[model samples]
Each structure stands twice: as structure tokens, then as C-alpha cells.
Target: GPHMTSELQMKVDFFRKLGYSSSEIHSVLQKLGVQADTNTVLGELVKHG
Candidate 1:
């Protein structure tokens, strides 16, 4: 959705770009102060984007 914030998207991109497994993105993001949900979707995108 378009409701995702730039900060949120950035973290997703950062993690996905690093080639992390999608399953672990959530935990990684949690450590970065990034909430799940939108972050999860973006992470899925990066996982296959």
C-alpha cells in the first residue's frame, strides 16, 4: 500500500538489499526500530524484488 513511510521502506530496502532471508527480516527490523506489517510487505518485495 501507499501508506508506507519512507523511513519504513528504507529499512526494508536496506535489509532486502543485503540479501537477508525474508523470514528473519522482521526480527532484524525490530532491532532497527522498524515495526512489522508494512515493513513485512516491503521486505517480501525485497526478498523477490
Candidate 2:
């Protein structure tokens, strides 16, 4: 869960291809209506780190 999946990486690349910076990859997730929260991402890392 702490790792990036191929699917997620693909999404990142999709944004990259769309001229969306990695820092702004959150925009893609936002367009998908998902909350880009720190805990949802980092908490998993903290738990599995």
C-alpha cells in the first residue's frame, strides 16, 4: 500500500502527457472526485514504513 501501483503510475503518466506536472497530478485525482489527502497517502506509508 505504501508503493505506487502500475495503474497509479499510468495515471501519473496520463497527467504528464496532458501537460500536467507531477506536483499537479492531484488535479487528475480531483477531476475523478477523490480527496487527495495526506493521511490517505502518508498514513499508509507510516503504517507500513
Candidate 3:
């Protein structure tokens, strides 16, 4: 499962809005101490947002 917390999800969402790609977003999350699957994260957002 692509487990994720709301905080990390929110950060990813914010970065995505800034036009970052999934790879870039994944790298940023690593630096920020977050572990998430960018693919799943964005897919979730697409479904819910």
C-alpha cells in the first residue's frame, strides 16, 4: 500500500500545484523526511480533489 499521512499529502499537493513533476516531488519529500508514492498520492488527489 502507498501509505501516507495528511501532512505529507498536503505538502505534495502544494508542490504539485507549483508545477513539480512526480519525480521532483518525490525527491523533495525525501529531503523533507516524508515517504510516499508520488504516483499513488497524485492518483488519490485526482480522485478526491
Candidate 4:
């Protein structure tokens, strides 16, 4: 979706490379200022990408 920022997608993938679980990724990224549900969706994207 074009509405989603590549910055956020990068963050999710960055953590994903470090072996972070979706929940853990959500926990840390929440501090970076994003909705929990948003991370969950992004996390799913990470799994595919």
C-alpha cells in the first residue's frame, strides 16, 4: 500500500533481520511512535518480504 511509509517498513525489516519476533518488534517500535496493530500488520509484511 502506498499509504504505508518505507521508513516504517525499513524499521520493521531492520528488526526482522536481527531475529525479533513480531510481538517484540511491536514492543520496541511502539516507542518509535506507531500503533501496536500497525506493527502487527507491518510484521506480516516483513515475513513475506
lDDT (0 to 1) per candidate? 0.60, 0.50, 0.63, 0.63
lDDT, candidate 1, equals: 0.60
Ranking by lDDT: 4, 3, 1, 2
Q: Which prediction has the highest TM-score against the true structure?
A: 3
TM-score of each: 0.38, 0.39, 0.46, 0.44
Residue by residue across 1-49, what tens digits does model 1's lDDT show? 7776687657556666777665566555656464456555565556655
* Clashing pairs in model 2, backbone N/Cα/C closer than 3 A: none
Off-target runs (Cα >4 Å) in candidate 4 are: 1-5, 34-49
TM-score of candidate 3 to 2 decimals? 0.46
RMSD of each: 9.2, 12.4, 11.0, 9.8
Sorting all predicted structures by TM-score, with the top scorer first, yields 3, 4, 2, 1
> What are the runs in model 3 whose C-alpha is more than 4 Å off?
1-5, 34-49
lDDT of 3 by residue, 4-47 (tens): 56786677668777775766666556664555565755654465
The residue-level lDDT of candidate 2 at 40 comes to 55
Error (Å) of candidate 3 at residue 39 is: 24
User: Per model, how many backbone clashes are there?
Assistant: 0, 0, 0, 0
